[PDB]
Design an enzyme around this catalytic site. Structure first.
Site, short mmCIF file in Angstrom:
data_model
loop_
_atom_site.label_atom_id
_atom_site.label_comp_id
_atom_site.label_asym_id
_atom_site.label_seq_id
_atom_site.Cartn_x
_atom_site.Cartn_y
_atom_site.Cartn_z
N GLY B 9 9.86 9.27 68.16
CA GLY B 9 8.50 9.18 68.65
C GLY B 9 7.46 10.05 67.88
O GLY B 9 6.26 9.91 68.02
N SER B 10 7.97 10.93 67.03
CA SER B 10 7.15 11.91 66.35
C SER B 10 6.47 11.22 65.17
O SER B 10 7.17 10.75 64.28
CB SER B 10 8.08 13.03 65.88
OG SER B 10 7.49 13.88 64.91
N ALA B 11 5.15 11.27 65.07
CA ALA B 11 4.47 10.75 63.87
C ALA B 11 4.86 11.45 62.57
O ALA B 11 5.15 10.78 61.59
CB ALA B 11 2.99 10.73 64.06
N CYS B 13 7.80 12.70 61.90
CA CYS B 13 9.10 12.12 61.55
C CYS B 13 8.96 10.72 61.00
O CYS B 13 9.64 10.37 60.02
CB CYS B 13 10.05 12.08 62.77
SG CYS B 13 10.60 13.79 63.19
N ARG B 14 8.12 9.91 61.61
CA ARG B 14 7.92 8.53 61.10
C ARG B 14 7.31 8.51 59.70
O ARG B 14 7.59 7.59 58.90
CB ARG B 14 7.13 7.73 62.13
CG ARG B 14 8.04 7.32 63.29
CD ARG B 14 7.31 6.57 64.38
NE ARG B 14 6.58 7.41 65.29
CZ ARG B 14 5.25 7.37 65.42
NH1 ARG B 14 4.50 6.58 64.63
NH2 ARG B 14 4.65 8.07 66.33
#
Ligand SMILES: N[C@@H](CCC(=O)N[C@@H](CS)C(=O)NCC(=O)O)C(=O)O
Ligand SMILES: N[C@@H](CCC(=O)N[C@@H](CS)C(=O)NCC(=O)O)C(=O)O
Lengths: 214, 213
Positions: B9-11, B13-14
């Site tokens: 869910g982490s931007a 991380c994405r």
């Protein structure tokens, strides 16, 4: 034409660039762009940089904002060797890492705590101060492990981080807990070319302006 | 192997999951449960004293900061120069947009939404407005360039699309931004592995938001 830098001396992001240019060996044509009086909001400045902020670099028509992008541009476009920003992907990544730490963690937490107080007359918030302390704790940790912030040599990331640390010092935040920060800071003051002119004086001026405004 | 400690869910991380697909780097994904302190174990801290994700472990070479990890994958493993050009001026435009993404776009989103989602606080319409300002600047960048930093998909598009998808997932209203919306369509199609790397995590984040909200 010489490379123009639209700047104000007290601005840490501007000092990032001033330091990088001295270290790389780039002479800039300095164009003072006073923010108090709105010089960043003229029609010609807006046309140059829609975000109406300093620093703005204009290298013969090639325009950048974002201090830390400017620093690495100077180093790769004009650097004599790569010591300040190594080509090696891993060493380069370390420098980038600490440039993002500087923006997103160190300087962000300083600004979060101090700018509303200085410019908005808000009370200094202790919770916010705390988060700036947390950022300093991390930096002290980095410097326990290595001579400089990103490794064993002085790089662009030390220059950005010293601009930020000198600003934090200038608002009389207590840096006494951070023994590794303090030792490093003395080292960078001596090692960074043109330190006193590019950074020290502007930082001291920021500190005067902070006192006056609060 | 090259490990990534993450949550989907982490931007940030994405940001990395997208870059990894674009460059063509297989990552051993190590899901890290933040709520139970898995980023706080001795072992984690030894690896990354800031105890945050994404953390990259490329055979002992450890990085944090999503955007530094993105550009490391390109620098170290990249085969397509257009994703992160070596030319100093082209590269500087990419770098400029990455700093825009961390310091203006995602910053202004986090300032507006995090206190609410994680602090119980009510949403401050003036903070949302500052997110608006960042979106206005982005929409402007995209008026006279196909992508955020030029004519090709770059690492900067990938960071910004993680940010914009997150902004969309909290039901912020993006209809005023015609250039952002056109660009967003293009990136969803252009970015290798876009659905796998970004879509499900952004949807997850949005569900979390709706729940905590
Ligand atoms: N992230 C930017 C920050 C630049 C910035 O905050 N500039 C301030 C002065 S310290 C400014 O020009 N503010 C005017 C404005 O944005 O309207 C950088 O590193 O260059
Ligand atoms: N600027 C960093 C931010 C990373 C970040 O804030 N990660 C959060 C998740 S979205 C986290 O791990 N928080 C836990 C902590 O900071 O202790 C990046 O771009 O990677």
């Amino acid at each position: 034409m010489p490379i123009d830098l639209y700047y104000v001396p007290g601005s840490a992001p501007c000092r990032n660039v001033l330091l990088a240019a001295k270290a790389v060996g780039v002479d800039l044509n300095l164009k003072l762009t006073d923010l108090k009086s709105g010089q960043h909001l003229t029609p010609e400045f807006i046309k140059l940089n829609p975000q109406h902020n300093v620093p703005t670099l204009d290298d013969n028509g090639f325009v950048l904002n974002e201090s830390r992008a400017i620093m690495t541009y100077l180093a790769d476009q004009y650097g004599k060797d790569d010591s300040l920003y190594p080509k090696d992907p891993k060493k380069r990544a370390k420098v980038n890492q600490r440039l993002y730490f500087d923006m997103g963690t160190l300087y962000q937490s300083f600004g979060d705590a101090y700018y509303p107080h200085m410019f908005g007359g808000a009370p200094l918030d202790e919770d916010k101060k705390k988060k700036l302390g947390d950022a300093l704790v991390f930096l002290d940790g980095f410097l326990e492990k290595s001579a400089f912030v990103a490794g064993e040599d002085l790089t662009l990331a030390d220059l950005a981080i010293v601009a930020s640390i000198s600003t934090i010092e200038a608002v009389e935040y207590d840096l006494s807990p951070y023994k590794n920060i303090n030792s490093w800071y003395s080292k960078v003051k001596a090692a960074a070319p043109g330190y006193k002119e590019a950074n020290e004086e502007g930082a001291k001026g920021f500190g005067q302006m902070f006192k006056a405004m609060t």
